[PDB]
Design a protein around this nucleic acid. Structure first.
Ligand SMILES: Nc1nc2c(ncn2[C@@H]2O[C@H](COP(=O)(O)OP(=O)(O)OP(=O)(O)O)[C@@H](O)[C@H]2O)c(=O)[nH]1
Ligand SMILES: Nc1nc2c(ncn2[C@@H]2O[C@H](COP(=O)(O)OP(=O)(O)OP(=O)(O)O)[C@@H](O)[C@H]2O)c(=O)[nH]1
Ligand SMILES: Nc1nc2c(ncn2[C@@H]2O[C@H](COP(=O)(O)OP(=O)(O)OP(=O)(O)O)[C@@H](O)[C@H]2O)c(=O)[nH]1
Ligand SMILES: [Ca+2]
Ligand SMILES: [Ca+2]
Ligand SMILES: [Ca+2]
Ligand SMILES: [Ca+2]
Ligand SMILES: [Mg+2]
Ligand SMILES: [Mg+2]
Ligand SMILES: [Mg+2]
Lengths: 951, 906
RNA sequence: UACCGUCGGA
RNA sequence: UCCGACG
RNA sequence: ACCGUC
């Protein structure tokens, strides 16, 4: 399609000759500024390089020189820029990423570029093996609309014509020029439906993520970032996958293994070849079935596990980790029989995804994606409910048990909060336990504010309570707590994520020591697992349910027996399955294994007791509709022969053909939804259509790895021959907010949502509402003060009258930009906030109000008076305005006004020092007990309470 | 001994017991004789202060008020029948020798204020108002008066009723608390009849007959029988009452499978899972306790959950080893489970120095054991020193270290805030955190650096006095017996309720390892045993206890200083270095000490035979048992003297296993319960034992390690001397050397000057230059500050210290100031310390005296200097400073994970 | 019209 | 409801 | 004129 080809010639910004000597980081950031301010990099209207940029340490400094009338963007953080300039794009396991977003040009001119490009700011991301081996600067990733999209918003030039093949060819046929480097595509992955960037002029469109490698560049030589050697993608992938020994593999599967080189991992240690135990065979079934029982799982030495703890800074030695090691991926577990101190790791065939020689350091490096960490209570999901009911001996009882768990959870949640609201110290404790903000505080070094309040609703409640506000007395705080509760109730109504205290998601591991019989599992916790009035350190003498998400077949949930084996006691925060029996238990859980799969584990006796296991179903033959492309790399090489030249050309062919495969429309979501709609209509997940759809969805998830081909024609045919045909199925009633159904709900999800959840939530909300004014005379104290001065002074009255009028203008701006767009809400609030802060006195009175010697104007007396006056005028009319603009100063006033002589001292803490503090649970309990008698140990030579007296 | 008790006048006869008690206290404190009519208003009083006000009269005018009982205690005494939520109101007194040596009161009485105390079986059965306890100097006691004899005092205490606050009190129990605690029971009173106001007359002999059921216990030695009164006085939480059908009285203990006849479950019994659940509910615990120390009727000891129990039925069992007298378990209060304590989450114990001689004695290689303990001590001290030095480099790390170093929570909770003396928190720890929370840096502000140095210097002086060997993998754990027969001899089961943390390593249970178990103190070489930790899944529910085998010839608990399972706790260590070289020793043959230790085993029945038969003789015998047991309880305490002698003997001989060591160890085990066992042992027998069997020395010198500095000659030879003076002391001295050098080394170091703190001063100076009125206000402020600075130098720099500082502070707060005066004052603010004037006063004072009088500036205005620092360091767009209320600030604590994660970014 | 789950963030 | 990382 | 625990 030639018309598209013309539109595929000028997509990338040009690299001007005047930037040819700039570092990669400056070249990237200058290019970004010109694109943002719509200035041509080749404009001759006078551009020449500035040597100051080469030694720069802030992006703003480079941009200031540019901000010329033509110039007069989001900035990379200074730490990232310094790492890009001096740190060789790496810092403490973090890599500097070069990434861009593309969208279809809304200009339909035949000469116009098809895509518009937004280069993203330099950012840090976890490194991977390929970046560690070749350098983060040699990698570039984009999001681009999928040329196969069926969306109405696809431009006619692609939709009308050979264009999809022309777009696919543009991505992979040759090198792309950008910031002085030649980039060649090596990998692509579905990125889901993404809304186009607002700056590019709102329907979501499916996009692909494409990875490029810098094969050559101006600074490249036939290692520092500025002194790189020419290296082809074909050589890059050959280093990773050692293709000469892997030609026997289906080329689509081989291509999918590239993800192992891109996996975001923490480098722990390099092992020497003599410390690596490569096993020739997996653990096989004792029965002789041939089934593998340790798929994805191997053992590691205790010393390796200690090194992981040390490198990652863990408080404890991990029992198991999700990792990668050369060609091996999956889980590694501590060998409980290791009494030695030698570093060693073992690999199994089921872990090794290609033939690897493990020679290069980076192919002998243990990389950890995640560690098995302390567990938390989990809950149910929509997929588990129909299967639990299907396998219930008494379906009425099972439905009653799940419903009781819902009512009990809501009752406890509302009860705990209503009690905490009676005391600020107790509500602060409750709010802190409700949400986590440590990550943001650490990354920002402070509580991030939006205008005059913390960005977070929970941080706002604690910030205002810390300054003396009472959630029973101040309606604004009451409103925040109400909004937070409403959101949680809505999530329950939408997802039925019913909390089960005796439940958790745990990494699955296999028993290399043969102590577990089939149908026995071992679960030991690293610490106390709390469930209301009861606690666990292990599971024993009880039945449990295990399952994986997604669960579809009736057999995808299994009832097994928890047995604690002392031999395994050191293995904590994992669930261990038997390696005996005909079939590994993991395989029964939606085709699971031990390579990072997690199991939902439930020991709730009321949910467990009624469950009857089903046998794994005979899967229907769907080969009429599902076609498998198993062409091997060797078969692709027949087009070229043998030798280095043939291997090189074949690698680029694997990439091109895999890109074509990767870009074909995927039907996993459409088929899963059809299954939900049809199985709802039939109220069955075990009848003939349910088994067909469950078998189909299980195949569509493994599509890229298995080379499954399944297009619209095959989906139409499958529906016609085995399902309801072209008929569009309606949504289940539970997708709606109310039961519009005739009679009383009968489907378990309808019943749980409309007969149990909605009524309970309505009653608990009314009781919460039954269990406060915007007005607070303390907050009007500064206004009353100045009004008295203004009454006896004409100069003060003019200042006072100007202030009121200026506040009124900003409030109207709040109503127009926020209360009632290309600009997102935070940007719109900032715009109002900047006009608010512009309200300044612009002489002894003016000087005392301004306190100009303070760098922060928000800390002077004027800011206090401005906040008080705004409160008096708008406390009731526009509460969101007064609090969002002046909440910070309202808290200052409250803390000043509630202070009493002799009763201690309020503390003005810095933003950094405030961020590092947390509520003291022991203080809360001890203080409340004093206010309102066995000394609770967790509340009050290590020997503690052993008796009050001596008798 | 005729007029010791304050008299009760007919004018207070109708007063409620609580009113009579508190009115009597005021007269005694103010030395007014009991001018006075009962105030009817007193009957309805809900505060002692209100009763005290009516007593305006000439004799009490100006007299200092006595310590007052809290309102809740008084209201419970007036309307709550001396009981509230298991707490009992206590009538207590302290008696002292009268300084007057006149032949014409021998004791001076101080009635203590009404207070709450945990109740006991006797107070819940008869009423707290019927019990009175005193602390009286033993007549056995150079401070003793010339008049002191013992017979006269004991007869005063036990011969007859004593009159106090309208009640007749009879003594029934005594134990050593120099001072002895004596308990009295109100047998009769003015309001008593042949609720607290209307109590029936009841004799001590009847009260004791109810508790001990004397008819079925005359076979017991009366001294031992008397000791069992403690079970009735033991402070316990009542859990529940059990029906007779729910009680399983066993006739026989668990016995050795080897036919030795040894009891393997001494003191321990099983309880139903549901009984344990009730314990959790009434005590408000987070989890169901696996084990409890309690009392039930005549039974005392440990009760453990029956792991084999699947029912919801409440039941408890008792064993002969638990039951301290023949009891029928009929009365509600003899069928009530009473909890002394519960087995709760464990903490690291460390290694007590007392154990080191036995550990050295049993070491396979003594030289290696000594070097290894010294190496562990040196590494710990070096780590402590390095961590303080490193943390000082960042305020976020130092705030965390200061918080870990000291605990101010109890003070914060009782005050509802950080207590402040003048302008700064009263504590140095809270002052560093308070100032660091407003942006001050100990590396930059010398005032903080100086406090920082002074805290570490104080920590070294604490390490010098108290030597401490830290062993993370150690704990004191309640001992229990395996009722279920899964543990082999030499096998123990330990499971924890939660993660027991050692640095970098963690445990929820112990398995596949050798452990050391012992009771403190350990005397015999065999008092420490090396055994095998084996985790039995059968016992997995039993947490925060250690379970011993019930197989073998002798129970393991008995090997640990003759211990058992009645509440005894074991020191359990799983540290491989401590366990490695330890070699078990057999229990030693104990010597015959009858020539020195005399036992009185006269039974209650034999004592009654000298008075007759029938009820009248029993009553006389009960009083006779009390009198004779009083005579016994007041004899001198040789456990302390013999234990002290043993430590010195073992030290001088540097041996715990030679013949004198074993003899003394056997002797101290015998004296552990002298009153209960009826062991008579006087100074003459102690002198004979020392001369004939211990080496001849009546007096031995104190061990060198009891002194702060090395006073020995040559290199230390005793293991404890070696650790204190060859290891710890040099390492501590090196740190103090480094500290002194660092102070001397410090123009880029910490300074007193901070231009931020002069910001307000400089602001007003520019205003003052252009206005005469402002200059006059500003110059008057400067002069008044100078006046207060002078007073600080005379009063503080040089009425106690807090009162003098507070005197200067009041003058500072009196420095007080037109539109300018109004803006500075902010009079709408109730607290003037929060006004702009306080900031100016603080800033001006800092500018004038930051170099001359730094202590004055910070102690008076530190609070406002912190406000200024936090204002001045705020940057636009870099977050918002937070003004915390004093209460809300007190409830926060450093986030340990924030500190760790934030530092990692840097 | 285009899935769920785990962890982290708005 | 969006963003990142995993199955 | 003792040690330990809470
Ligand atoms: N080492 C030591 N152990 C004691 C002491 N008092 C009690 N015990 C231990 O406690 C056990 C039971 O003591 P009880 O008198 O029943 O009550 P208790 O509350 O444990 O005793 P205290 O430890 O004095 O509070 C026994 C001992 O193992 C004491 O002074 N020293
Ligand atoms: N619903 C759903 N499940 C997914 C998705 N991606 C992965 N899964 C689940 O994860 C399974 C794939 O397991 P992986 O560990 O990625 O790979 P594998 O199938 O074991 O194959 P190997 O990589 O050869 O070991 C399948 C699903 O059960 C997804 O997008 N949606
Ligand atoms: N060093 C020391 N040990 C004490 C002291 N009081 C109790 N103990 C210890 O506690 C033990 C006594 O145990 P108890 O529970 O009081 O009673 P018992 O000796 O078992 O006798 P019964 O009351 O008949 O069970 C012994 C000591 O090891 C004390 O004051 N000093
Ligand atoms: Ca898998
Ligand atoms: Ca797999
Ligand atoms: Ca005992
Ligand atoms: Ca005993
Ligand atoms: Mg699999
Ligand atoms: Mg004993
Ligand atoms: Mg005994």
């Amino acid at each position: 399609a030639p018309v598209v080809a013309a539109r595929l010639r000028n997509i990338w910004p040009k690299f001007p000759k005047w930037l040819h000597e700039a570092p990669l980081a400056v070249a990237w950031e200058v290019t970004r500024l010109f694109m943002h301010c719509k200035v041509d990099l080749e404009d001759e209207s006078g551009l020449k390089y500035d040597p100051s940029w080469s030694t720069a340490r802030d992006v703003t400094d480079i941009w200031k020189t540019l901000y010329l009338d033509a110039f007069r963007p989001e900035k990379p953080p200074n730490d990232v820029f310094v790492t890009a300039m001096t740190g060789n794009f790496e810092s403490k396991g973090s890599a500097v990423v070069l990434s861009a977003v593309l969208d279809y040009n809304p200009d339909n001119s035949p000469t116009a570029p098809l895509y518009l490009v937004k280069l993203k700011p330099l950012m840090f991301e976890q490194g991977c093996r390929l970046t560690r081996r070749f350098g983060p600067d040699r990698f570039f990733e984009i999001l681009i609309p999928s040329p196969t999209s069926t969306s109405p918003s696809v431009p006619p030039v692609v939709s009308k014509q050979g264009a999809v093949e022309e777009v696919i060819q543009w991505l992979t046929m040759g090198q792309h020029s950008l910031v002085g480097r030649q980039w060649r595509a090596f990998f692509a992955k579905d990125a889901g439906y993404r809304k186009p960037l607002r700056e590019f002029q709102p329907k979501p469109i499916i996009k692909e993520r494409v990875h490029f490698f810098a094969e050559t560049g101006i600074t490249f030589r036939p290692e520092p970032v500025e002194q790189r050697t020419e290296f082809k993608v074909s050589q890059m992938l050959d280093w990773l996958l050692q293709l000469d020994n892997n030609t026997w593999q289906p080329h689509l599967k081989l291509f999918s293994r590239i993800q192992l080189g891109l996996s975001k991992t923490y480098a722990i240690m390099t092992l020497e070849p003599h410390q690596i135990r490569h096993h020739k065979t997996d653990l096989l079934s004792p029965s002789g079935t041939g089934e593998v029982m340790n798929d994805g799982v191997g053992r590691m030495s205790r010393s390796v596990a200690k090194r992981i703890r040390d490198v990652l800074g863990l408080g404890d030695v991990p029992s198991a980790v999700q990792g990668r090691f050369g060609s091996a991926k999956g889980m590694w577990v501590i060998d409980v029989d290791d009494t030695g101190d030698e570093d060693w790791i073992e690999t199994y065939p089921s872990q090794r995804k290609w033939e690897c020689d493990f020679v290069d350091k980076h192919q002998r490096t243990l990389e950890v994606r995640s560690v098995a960490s302390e567990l938390k209570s989990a809950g149910l999901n929509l997929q588990l409910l129909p299967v639990l009911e299907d396998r219930a001996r008494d379906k009425v009882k099972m439905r009653q048990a799940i419903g009781d768990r819902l009512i009990n959870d809501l009752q406890r949640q509302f009860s705990e909060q209503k009690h905490a609201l009676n005391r600020p110290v107790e509500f602060r404790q409750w709010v802190y336990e409700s949400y986590s903000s440590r990550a943001t505080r650490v990354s920002h070094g402070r509580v991030p504010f939006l205008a005059g309040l913390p960005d977070s609703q929970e941080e706002t409640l604690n910030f205002l309570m810390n300054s003396g506000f009472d959630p029973k007395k101040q309606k604004y705080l009451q409103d925040i707590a109400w909004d937070l509760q409403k959101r949680k109730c809505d999530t329950l109504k939408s997802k039925l994520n019913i909390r089960v205290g005796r439940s958790a998601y745990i990494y699955m591991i296999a028993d290399f020591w043969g102590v577990l019989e089939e149908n026995e599992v071992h679960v030991g916790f690293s610490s106390k697992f709390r469930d209301e009035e009861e606690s666990f350190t292990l599971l024993s003498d009880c039945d449990v349910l295990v399952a994986r998400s997604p669960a579809h077949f009736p057999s995808d949930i299994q009832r097994v027996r928890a047995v604690f084996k002392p031999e395994l006691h050191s293995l904590k925060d994992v669930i261990i399955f038997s390696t005996k029996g005909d079939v590994p238990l993991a395989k029964k859980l939606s085709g699971g294994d031990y390579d990072g799969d997690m199991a939902w584990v439930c020991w709730d006796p009321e949910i467990v007791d009624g469950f009857v296991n089903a046998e794994m179903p005979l899967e229907p033959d769907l080969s009429r509709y599902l076609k498998k492309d198993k062409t091997t790399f060797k078969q692709l090489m027949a087009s070229h022969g043998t030798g280095s030249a043939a291997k090189e050309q074949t690698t680029y062919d694997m990439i091109q053909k895999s890109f074509h495969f990767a870009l074909q429309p995927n039907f996993l979501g459409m088929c899963t939804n059809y299954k939900e709609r049809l199985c709802y209509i039939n109220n069955s997940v075990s009848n003939k259509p349910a088994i067909i759809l469950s078998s189909l969805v299980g195949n569509l998830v493994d599509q890229s790895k298995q080379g499954i081909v399944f297009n619209e024609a095959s989906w139409a045919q499958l529906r016609r021959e085995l399902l309801g045909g072209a008929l569009s199925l309606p949504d289940p009633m539970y997708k709606s907010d109310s039961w519009l159904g005739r009679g009383e709900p009968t489907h378990i999800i309808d019943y749980l949502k409309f007969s149990i959840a909605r009524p309970a939530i309505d009653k608990e909300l009314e009781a919460f509402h039954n269990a406060a004014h915007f007005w607070d005379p303390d907050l009007a104290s500064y206004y009353t003060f100045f009004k008295e001065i203004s009454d006896k002074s004409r100069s003060s009255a003019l200042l006072f009258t100007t202030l009121k009028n200026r506040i009124g203008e900003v409030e109207k701006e709040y109503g127009r930009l926020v209360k009632n767009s290309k600009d997102p809400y935070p940007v719109r609030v900032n715009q109002v906030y900047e006009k608010w802060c512009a309200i300044t006195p612009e002489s002894k009175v003016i000087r005392l109000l301004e306190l100009s010697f303070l760098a922060d104007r928000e800390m002077n007396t004027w800011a206090l008076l401005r906040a008080s006056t705004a409160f008096k005028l708008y406390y009731h009319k526009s509460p969101k305005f007064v609090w969002q603009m002046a909440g910070r100063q309202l808290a200052y006033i409250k803390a000043q006004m509630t202070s009493r002589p002799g009763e201690g001292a309020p503390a003005l803490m810095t933003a950094f020092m405030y961020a590092g503090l947390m509520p003291d649970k022991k203080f809360t309990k001890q203080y409340v007990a004093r206010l309102e008698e066995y000394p609770d140990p967790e509340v009050y030579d290590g020997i503690g309470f052993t008796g009050n007296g001596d008798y």
